[PDB]
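Tutorial sheet, problem 5. The three components below are modelled jointly, 1611 residues in total.
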Amino acid sequence: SGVGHSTGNYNNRTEFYYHGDEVTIVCHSSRHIHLNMSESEEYKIYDTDRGPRFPTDQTLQGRDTINDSYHAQVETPWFLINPNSWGTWMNPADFQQLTTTCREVTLEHLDQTLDNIVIKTVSKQGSGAEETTQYNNDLTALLQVALDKSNQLPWVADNMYLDSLGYIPWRPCKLKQYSYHVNFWNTIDIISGPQQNQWQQVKKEIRWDDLQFTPIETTTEIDLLRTGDSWTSGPYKFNTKPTQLSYHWQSTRHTGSVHPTDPPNAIGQQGQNIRDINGWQWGDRSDPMSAATRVSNFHIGYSWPEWRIHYGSGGPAINPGAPFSQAPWSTDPQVRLTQGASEKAIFDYNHGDDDPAHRDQWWQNNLPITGQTNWAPKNAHQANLSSNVPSRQEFWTQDYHNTFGPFTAVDDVGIQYPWGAIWTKTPDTTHKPMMSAHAPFICKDGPPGQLLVKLAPNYTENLQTDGLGNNRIVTYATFWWTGKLILKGKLRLPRQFNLYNLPGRPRGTEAKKFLPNEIGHFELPFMPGRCMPNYTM
Amino acid sequence: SGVGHSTGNYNNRTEFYYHGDEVTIVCHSSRHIHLNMSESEEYKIYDTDRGPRFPTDQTLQGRDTINDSYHAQVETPWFLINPNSWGTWMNPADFQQLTTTCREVTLEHLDQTLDNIVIKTVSKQGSGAEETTQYNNDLTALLQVALDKSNQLPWVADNMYLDSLGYIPWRPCKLKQYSYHVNFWNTIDIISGPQQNQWQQVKKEIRWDDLQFTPIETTTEIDLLRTGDSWTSGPYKFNTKPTQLSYHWQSTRHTGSVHPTDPPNAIGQQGQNIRDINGWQWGDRSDPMSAATRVSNFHIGYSWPEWRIHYGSGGPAINPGAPFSQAPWSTDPQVRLTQGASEKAIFDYNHGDDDPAHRDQWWQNNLPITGQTNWAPKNAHQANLSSNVPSRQEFWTQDYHNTFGPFTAVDDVGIQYPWGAIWTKTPDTTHKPMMSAHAPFICKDGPPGQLLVKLAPNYTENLQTDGLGNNRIVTYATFWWTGKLILKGKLRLPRQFNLYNLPGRPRGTEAKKFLPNEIGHFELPFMPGRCMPNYTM
Amino acid sequence: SGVGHSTGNYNNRTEFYYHGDEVTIVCHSSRHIHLNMSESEEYKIYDTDRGPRFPTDQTLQGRDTINDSYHAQVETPWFLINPNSWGTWMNPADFQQLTTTCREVTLEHLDQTLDNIVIKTVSKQGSGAEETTQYNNDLTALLQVALDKSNQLPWVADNMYLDSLGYIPWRPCKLKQYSYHVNFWNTIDIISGPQQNQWQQVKKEIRWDDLQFTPIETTTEIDLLRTGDSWTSGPYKFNTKPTQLSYHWQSTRHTGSVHPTDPPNAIGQQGQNIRDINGWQWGDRSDPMSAATRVSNFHIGYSWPEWRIHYGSGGPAINPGAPFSQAPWSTDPQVRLTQGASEKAIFDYNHGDDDPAHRDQWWQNNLPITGQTNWAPKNAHQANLSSNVPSRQEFWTQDYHNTFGPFTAVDDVGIQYPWGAIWTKTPDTTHKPMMSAHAPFICKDGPPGQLLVKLAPNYTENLQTDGLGNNRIVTYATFWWTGKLILKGKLRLPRQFNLYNLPGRPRGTEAKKFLPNEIGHFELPFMPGRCMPNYTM
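Model answer (structure tokens):
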């Protein structure tokens, strides 16, 4: 190109192609990215404060230790571009088209580019209120671009902390610095002290002798780009497995053969369960034949120590448990039952909040997903199962056992449209996780490479080793990210006689939200991604 | 054919073909099926009573809520033919041949037909004790036949409720109507009230806005058959995995290298465990070297909250646990220990009971399967494992934890000959069950399609919309189902020097049972299907 | 075939095929039809009573003369099978699939058959309460089948009077006799008498000298069918034009360039219309430049003498006017404004009512269709249009003029799912109608031929010319109609950023309707067929 030729165009429109039972979705996305000169040109390793609302005393007996943010990390001068959110890609009407017409979807491949690089230096004349800023584009300045296609850098592209390209095509995007954890010990003893009601710090430190420090420079090759230059990543092919776009309402009581019933006679009458019937029960039960004790081949859902806080080497964390809905147990609407492994997105103006300077939030309670719902305290167990009822003993109620086992069938959450991550890195361990607690797609052979960008340091006349920022000219860049990810769906067709409830906005919400304001402010709606019902087995 | 030509024959004999280490079993089965005019020509959706022996009060503190039969369902006018039981296929001597000569077996493919359709209308003349019935075959009447080969209907072909073609070749079979569950909430709180000793209904209702209604007519294509007509399903090919025809007696103490022992000298003496030996223990143990604390690679069996009652969206159900034998713990014969995930078949005259008007029962306690036996209260855990014994603390006994994990190896029940189901539908969920609590074969790609039959309604002169059965002529049909399923076994050969105990009748039983009576009444014997012992590892 | 072979099968399932922007919908439908012996074997010509609720006096000044049912007709012994309703074809979930995924649809071709003919004679023995009916199938009896593929018979297949094959696949259908109007004069003078407030009959008579009588026998060839016989119509190809599956919200004030506006500043402020602007107005207006008087190229909608009663040769009728919504004018919900050329379906158990012995009704007020809404009394006209406002004179308000003209653009109603007709006969006149007030498809070259059926008369031993029904044996038939119509849609894709409101049940309704009952009773929902919004110009 040159100084005066643009190196790319803008395509943010998505494509649907229906042939047979297959549906190809080509999602185009384009962003205008504002980049600033790095705060420091150096890599920094440091630990942090314990975080806000962490206990300084034992008044709460240490139940507040779940508010630990403590950690250690390497501060990279680079910046991360991840398009790892749904909604960086599709608009609300495009995701509605996806989930109405597709029963499941996969990731096919990903492309992305960077072009129309503009680097400006900001100069100031005069002083005081007479100070005048001038923005001069530096035509010979460089932008540094690193993509690790070999996945040799630590992966932090999880959309957690919602650091991702924004969801609204016409607004500018602003990157966050690339940073990763180093080895540290944070171990908190909540059993400490007499009566074992006190919490105590055991070890909180950076672990230096075991630590790993990998810079971007010695790891991946870096492209240096002027104004007339562009960058393409090349094709990336996913290998994942499809995600279900439907939700399952069947429990193990909704599942198999139906208990023999005598039909009702008139419009007010109910069916009657037949008393003497033949079939397979579990224990010695031969007379009750309760549909409850009917033997089945599998079991849908499992119990857990809901809100399991694992106090590990790095600190307390949550061990999630299975997703489901508390709607069958809900009763009072005011009380909010979080126990279905619910999640909550806290988001901002670029990520689909209408208000600048304040953040909005969405608690996904997973209401459509029932039949998987297992509240651990509601369960029980008996010593024996037979024609006799056990006594006060022989019967236990509130336990909180993990009942995951070889016979259980569960679901995952699925796509969570605006704020949910798309793919995920697979942990490199002897036993790889069977499924993911958040991201619908697990990458079997390496996640899409991380695109890291940096402005090359632009130095003044004098260069002093003692100097940091006083030594470089104040600089910023704006450029354009474009990307294309392609999806493969499977055509959804009616499986029932009656009308479906088709995808749409969340229940209590209206449509004046989600539409631009007099100032241009609007939100993106939550789209479940498991949308319409389907049979399990 | 025509009115006066028969459209098929009767083949109920089974074939064994031995070539090399492979053995092909071709099971032929033929049934004479009696069908009646549907009670109603319409689809009905209704819920039921809570069931017999369900509590109307809190006297039992709500431990009787396991007797819940409540549910909701769509009443289809159609009728189900499922040959999904073992024993619809093989007679007792044919299944003995299978389990003596085969170490494992698979399902190969299934064929089935319907032919020799006979439809009669029953007319009555006179009134009172002079009333005379006449049975006239209606040559132009139709039989409706629907097979869903695409598995688009809810699957209820689980042989639970023993609704399946009968086990005795020369007796007539009688179908049950096809029915499936709809979406309903049944949630029972057994923690309710002060002291948390009371039970309460939370939500019991049909869930209408989320409900799915699929008729047979809008789903699958229906064949209309006269007398001279027949129906073949076409070939169905299973893809499953083999089932083990042997039982495993080895626990993790029966498994690996043997503790070093000094042999006995004379006929009364025992071996002595050598005191100072070298090897891998678990904790700091270096001196005891108890075979108990020898490290092993795996563990055989797992604990569970035996008789786990999961109170889910549809109601309470049992979360099974692993099958095993209580025989090592049995002691007193009178007490019946159900905790090995035992099952009980309640069956009737056509399904292998000798007495009409009464039902017999068989409690399968799984006695041969040991080494998998884990009674959860009998276990323990310690804080540390070392050359020292822990104190009163540091040692816990009755826990009921699920100990299934990454190192565990377990079995399933296997074939349960007369009353057990053969195959099963795989639940459509993110995590598919690792194995099945009952049916020995899991269908990876769709279960054999369900054959639904119906008599077309035969109407009188006048047709009134207000009329139901007063509008159609009283009609019934008899026809002949034939089917062929083929099995692939692997030849069993002696692995030991000493004599085996070969398959036969259950222990306490005699042979005057299982043989016809002066009236022709007899039972079919339970055949374990895991019959002879084998080594695990 | 023969007596004992069935001549066809049952396929009621619908198919969707998506390739590119084209979508083929193959609708299969199958009905079980109950036919009775004709009331008379002869053609009858007669006139009727004036009808219920017609005035016998002048108390209402003759405004009740709109309740005239009077007419004359030829009574044919034959019976009509018309599948001319939407909903004879698709179920609610299949029509939802159509209107979500298609922006417009055409009719492609139609096939239909008749098979599995069963003819029974009913005999009675004894007398009194001892009387015994016997139903004997007469194997040599005939069914008469006439299809006029040349459209030489009068066409009465308009689904008006909802005489059409039923909407529920599993219920029996019952035909109505074929009948058509003859030439009669009915002329009512509502101007009669002094003060012109009285109504009077002018001429009410059958017009015999001009009358036309066409039997089925001398017109079309008739097929005679035994039990082992079937009938296929052959292919019929439609030539029609597509119907729009979207509704238009734009009026002529929603349409073109927008009035110049000064945008709002903060969240509560509104835009301000700019005062001095340049553009094309209508009259001498140069200063006001009201968006109202902006010249436009076309005009959307037209006024009418709403509820125009044309007193013609055959009697009073309604001259419809354009369809639109009264929702912008609605205000009070209790008052029901009918003036948008609304329609009302009155239907019964087979046609989608849940209650037998009572009828339900649906008033289609066409609420989504706005921008076409022209209430004639709300309009006005002025003498001159200029910078001056006219006086009390020069301005007229309540007029009721027909404002249809050369510049107007209007819509039609579109598909009305359960009860609406599909196609229509084109009147043979010098000026053919531009569009249709009800049926979405006008047949340019002949409507699908009318299928007329009749049982051949089955006579007793003696045949007397004086005898009518006393001469023929009491007979009825049941048989099976199958048909296939194929549609061509155009793929609907998102035209907007925000979420659509997707097709579903009518607003105030719940889903416990539309789903089967404990007795099996349910309704079919109204599906608009103009479902989602779209831009006009």
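Marking note: The longest strand of chain C covers residues 102-125. Full credit if you identified this.
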